């Protein structure tokens, strides 16, 4: 009950005559009324510092250039590949023929089959971009 | 398609390391990811890409992957780690993801207890109501992981049965039940009905006949 | 904040059609795969298939090919998991997760429960027998059901098992107590089952035979 008067950036120590004490360095309290401050996330290794820590906000991490964040709060870093590639365990590998990837991350997915709906292919697809189908036989020859 | 095998139950003692294997054909050619899940809660990843650990996961969680086995290692296992663990992988061949069967890591807090099995033949009132329901009750066992096998005179039956999930009882030991709903004509048609209950490898049985 | 909010719990009947949704907010929904995961009651996780909402490309695992349909309306950042005719084997928990391999975000999961919702009253059958005296209540709808022994008296060593869904879609559970073998004819043991929806309350004593 008495600890509620300690705001964010402090922790409550009832052994003090002035119970609300500010957080030590590398430490934060984001809510207030807490008996401790949490230790600032350090963005170590494959992590990088986006917003440095403060007394009231944890440090925010993003990944190093050649990586991309995954998970809540950038908890993970998956390696970036190029466009037209996908990430396999042996490294970044080009998309196989018939597949494409328009992102610097993820897997290759196949082209949309224009032949299934009876349409010719207007522009050739590539590793980076999908195909663009021509008109259906109903518009191309009957309307 | 692809299949990943992990043992259904692994036990470990407080403070000692637990290892949980995830075996599949050439899984060492893929990235292995481990997911932790606790009762009533969505799965949360603990290890991704074989060995890497996400931020916020204790450093006691460890992972490796080579050959035909990926394994999750937990040094100094504490009571908060008792949960189901699922390995997962994505293979480009077919472009599908597959989960392992799941491993219930039990942190031992009491000695292992063999299950006491009780089989009740159907009451005459149920028999009078043209309903035959053999019930098999498993109690006072630990860890909480059992598979039941229904035998009708050394013959398996699987069409009409449903079994419960192990739940802790008053003395913290686990308990479960199994319901075989047979026909009163099919009841007096066979010689004996046994309830085979396997727990930690050991299997106990209880038969009842008219 | 990146979030995946799923539909509310569903209670359908066998043969009915159903479509649950998975709304992904806080990120570019079009350029992240959405995978649907099945988890049966008391079973493990099953990858059902994924979808890329950018161009609605879909993929399925062999266990679910031709069993369900996965769709995405990227104009409202929502993925779908659709059935055409629900079987009783479809009772499970259905999560949506972001990603093809690493599932870094999980929705709270959508619970489906397929059964013939015609509420029925339970029939109570005894289990004649430290021995085990039991009480069997079977075929009722819906949950829950509480069983008291000797009018809430015998509380030591008594256990009531969780319900189970039979093939008929009606529930069943058993209550058991480990009364000492010495005490048998001296005291008659009786259970007390109360089915609240059907307003059913019936007691029956368990005696040897
Ligand atoms: C597409 O590529 C094929 C293979 O090189 C070629 O034969 C065809 O003429 C191309 N068509 C268009 C419209 O680019």
Author numbering:
A (entry chain C): 26 to 168
B (entry chain B): 1 to 210
C (entry chain A): 1 to 129, 138 to 217
Question: What did the published study say regarding this structure?
Answer:
4-1BB is not expressed on naive T cells but is rapidly upregulated after T-cell receptor engagement with cognate MHC:peptide complex expressed on antigen presenting cells.
The utomilumab and urelumab binding sites on 4-1BB were confirmed by ELISA experiments in which 4-1BB mutants M101R and I132R showed reduced binding for utomilumab but not urelumab, while receptor mutant N42R showed reduced binding for urelumab but not utomilumab. Importantly, the utomilumab binding site lies on the same face as the ligand binding site. While the ligand and utomilumab binding sites do not directly overlap, they are adjacent. Rather than directly blocking the binding site of the ligand, utomilumab sterically occludes the ligand interaction which is clearly evident when the receptor-bound structure of utomilumab is overlaid over the structure of the receptor–ligand complex. In the overlapping structure, utomilumab’s major steric clash is with the adjacent ligand monomer which is only minimally engaged with the antibody-bound receptor.
